[PDB]
């Protein structure tokens, strides 16, 4: 019967919740009480990239920490050179409605997608020197919200159809499909080892997925509204979520609990992007307050603010070497903060 | 450097194309269309000339782009903000929905649901300033439907004859009672005129009005 399984199912949530309390020995805030603070983090706009004629939704750094990508509703995908602020490529999109970007780890490929329900992959290194579109991954039924390359052939995408998928670019078919989210999936983050990835959905939950098996290992709750951004800790043993509850939370994968909440009474708008520092000591979160805060990731003390944007800070990414932090916004400008 | 210099030559040749095409594109007119499945958006688009379907037609040297977002079947909360700043919001409702009901809900009138969508859209925080063109289609069909069937069925409080004129009127103002931003947005309602297809000329005229009112901002009238 439905009630047999339901009265059963609500019990299974109890042992999960019962065991999590038993493993809640002491709060990270108590353990990190005597750590010396990070001090005022004064970070200034070094470079400002101009050339977008609409609001920016997505940006992604390169693995060489110098090039980066950005997409906007103007239907242009631009590859920047952050050092010399000069445009390397300006890719016209078939669909002006683009909500995500990814720059391949090898830098041979770039991918974008949005309301067109397609993940388009553009080839950068092309004999005829004109970025050409390679493949169009059309297997989703809702807007694509995120996409992250594993290799030049594997890309994992999260969509508004409550499902994530792992693709094979050569064949253009979903190698694996991740199901179990009861709300629209907003963002995903890959583990450093590229064996696991966590996804945040509109159902106020984050799920840890396994890329090979295709089954969800753990599910984290605690937020009150949509989860809009997610990133792993550098060591791949923790991750942070940005929600519309104007709180950032640091979850652990081994302890399977929540550690911190980064909430401030002053802040009432929703978090749009989150990202870490190379050491994992700073958690940069791009709010709707038009500004971007920098949190002490082990003290939960707002040490630093990056207020330079007219409109909301849509995307926010840090370099692999951690020498810079770049924030996009709806004001059509990318700013490199160092 | 020799290299760096040639580089930035490209970067400016990029920027020339950007601005240029940005201005070719900014010249186009962007209408967002919404509605119920049977609103007859399909029949409107037919009159005017996957996922988000885009439609292109020109009228009196004006280019129109229509973003039929009918099928997204996802949380509108997350993707509507993308269309903020479309010139106007064409909204189609079929007048023939007063006696119906969705096959999914028990007895919630299709018309009462049409209002709720409009309610949430005319009162959407992202379109505080946007004008709303309201096409009310299916007028003839409403005429026949009303000629036999009462309107009290849908509006229990209705003081008026089943005369098409009076009947429609109530509704029109009824839809226009949804907006809280009374002189913040202007609702230009038209009744679908099948044959003349001046459905489009109404649009031409509707568009200009909103544009003209907006120009009174850009013209430095302040």
């Amino acid at each position: 019967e439905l009630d047999q399984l339901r009265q059963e199912a609500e019990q299974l949530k109890n042992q999960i919740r019962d065991a999590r309390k038993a493993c809640a020995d002491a709060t990270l805030s108590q353990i990190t009480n005597n750590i010396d603070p990070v001090g005022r983090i004064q970070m200034r706009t070094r470079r400002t990239l101009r050339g977008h004629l609409a609001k920016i939704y997505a940006m992604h750094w390169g693995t060489d920490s110098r090039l980066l990508v950005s997409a906007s509703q103007d239907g242009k995908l631009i590859i920047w050179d952050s050092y010399t602020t000069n445009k390397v490529h300006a890719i016209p999109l078939r669909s002006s409605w683009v909500m995500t970007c990814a720059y391949a780890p090898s830098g041979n490929y770039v991918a974008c997608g949005g309301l067109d329900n397609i993940c388009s992959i553009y080839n950068l290194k092309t004999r005829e020197g004109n970025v050409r579109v390679s493949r169009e991954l059309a297997g989703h039924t809702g807007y694509l919200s995120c996409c992250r390359f594993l290799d030049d052939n594997q890309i994992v995408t999260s969509s508004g159809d409550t499902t994530c998928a792992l693709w094979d670019i050569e064949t253009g078919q979903q190698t694996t499909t991740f199901t179990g989210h009861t709300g629209d999936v907003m963002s995903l983050s890959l583990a450093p080892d590229t064996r696991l990835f966590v996804s945040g959905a509109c159902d106020a939950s984050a799920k840890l997925w396994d890329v090979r098996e295709g089954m969800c290992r753990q599910t984290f709750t605690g937020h009150e509204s949509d989860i809009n951004a997610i990133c792993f800790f550098p060591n791949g043993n923790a991750f942070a979520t940005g929600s519309d509850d104007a709180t950032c939370r640091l979850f652990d994968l081994r302890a399977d609990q929540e550690l911190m909440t980064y909430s401030h009474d002053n802040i009432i708008c929703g978090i749009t992007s989150v990202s870490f520092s190379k050491s994992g000591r700073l958690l940069l979160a791009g709010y709707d307050d038009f500004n971007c805060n920098v949190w002490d990731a082990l003290k939960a003390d707002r040490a630093g603010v990056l207020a330079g944007h007219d409109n909301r800070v849509s995307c926010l990414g840090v370099t692999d070497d951690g020498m810079a932090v770049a924030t996009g916004s709806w004001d059509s400008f990318l700013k490199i903060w160092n | 450097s020799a290299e760096d210099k040639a580089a930035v030559e490209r970067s400016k040749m990029i920027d020339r194309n950007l601005r240029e095409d940005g201005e070719k594109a900014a010249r186009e007119v962007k209408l967002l269309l919404l509605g119920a499945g049977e609103s007859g958006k399909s029949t409107i688009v037919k009159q005017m000339k996957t996922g988000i379907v885009e439609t292109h037609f020109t009228f009196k040297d004006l280019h129109f782009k229509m973003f039929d977002v009918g099928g997204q079947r996802s949380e509108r909360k997350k993707w509507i903000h993308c269309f903020e700043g479309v010139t106007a919001i064409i909204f189609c409702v079929a007048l023939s929905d007063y006696d119906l009901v969705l096959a999914e809900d028990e007895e919630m009138n299709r018309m009462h649901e049409s209002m709720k969508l409009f309610d949430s859209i005319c009162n959407n925080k992202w379109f505080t300033d946007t004008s709303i063109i309201l096409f009310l289609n299916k007028k003839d069909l409403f005429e026949e439907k009303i000629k036999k069937s009462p309107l009290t069925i849908c509006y229990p409080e209705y003081a008026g004859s089943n005369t098409y004129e009076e009947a429609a009127a109530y509704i029109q103002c009824q839809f226009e009672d949804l907006n809280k931003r009374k002189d913040t947005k202007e609702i230009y309602t038209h009744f679908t005129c099948a044959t003349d297809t001046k459905n489009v000329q109404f649009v031409f005229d509707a568009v200009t009005d909103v544009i003209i009112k907006n120009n009174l901002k850009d013209c430095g009238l302040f």
Partner: single-chain antibody
């Protein structure tokens, strides 16, 4: 992606002839083109250059004010207008394409060039090795020397390498020091700093025997070096 040029042949001195290079199979409108001439017995020598969209036109010392270079983007052609040819303009005129953006490979593709026989503050690159004997399966190193520090401020040593097999157009091997061109085996490698440069081949074959060239790109007019022919 082939490039073919038209013209050349036999011209009396003082005559004005035109060279047309019809690009085919690539985005010609976004490629900075060059012209490079090779004397019948001597090495390469840069002559002209046009940027993308005819924004920047440069020339060599020997052809300044004597040559006019133009491009026709819609027809995918490149033109060279030569005026009052001298006896020292007898050379094979290759046409080279190059695109300049972060990480690009300029001078990657070379035309077949045309034969032209007239009737009758500059960096100098020096390599004093010619007709060096070598056997297949051995390791050979080719050394180059500059008169100026090619290592720019940003760390880019704008030194290039080329390989001209007998009876073929020159082919890029190394577009900057410690970099490897597209479609060239891993055997070729180059390590150097400032004014000292080397090209190391681990194991060679009958296919890569020929003459090698060194070019700098720190500043115009892109002076080349003398040849370095591998003997086999």
């Amino acid at each position: 992606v082939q490039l073919v040029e038209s013209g050349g042949g036999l011209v009396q001195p003082g005559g004005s002839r035109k060279l047309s290079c019809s690009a085919s199979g690539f985005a010609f409108s976004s490629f900075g083109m060059h012209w490079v001439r090779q004397a019948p017995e001597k090495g390469l020598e840069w002559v002209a250059y046009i940027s993308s969209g005819s924004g920047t036109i440069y020339y060599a010392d020997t052809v300044k004010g004597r040559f006019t270079i133009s491009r026709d983007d819609p027809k995918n052609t490149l033109f060279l207008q030569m005026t009052s040819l001298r006896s020292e303009d007898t050379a094979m005129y290759y046409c080279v394409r190059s695109i300049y953006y972060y990480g690009s490979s300029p001078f990657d593709f070379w035309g077949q060039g045309t034969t032209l026989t007239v009737s009758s503050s500059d960096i100098v690159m020096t390599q004093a090795t010619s007709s060096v004997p070598v056997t297949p399966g051995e390791s050979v190193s080719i050394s180059c020397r500059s008169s100026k520090s090619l290592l720019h401020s940003n760390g880019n040593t704008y030194l290039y390498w080329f390989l001209q097999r007998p009876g073929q157009s020159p082919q890029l091997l190394i577009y900057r020091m410690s970099n490897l061109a597209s479609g060239v085996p891993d055997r070729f490698s180059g390590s150097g700093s400032g004014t000292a440069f080397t090209l190391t081949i681990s194991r060679l074959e009958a296919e890569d025997v020929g003459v090698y060239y060194c070019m700098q790109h720190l500043e115009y007019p892109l002076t080349f070096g003398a040849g370095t022919k591998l003997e086999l």
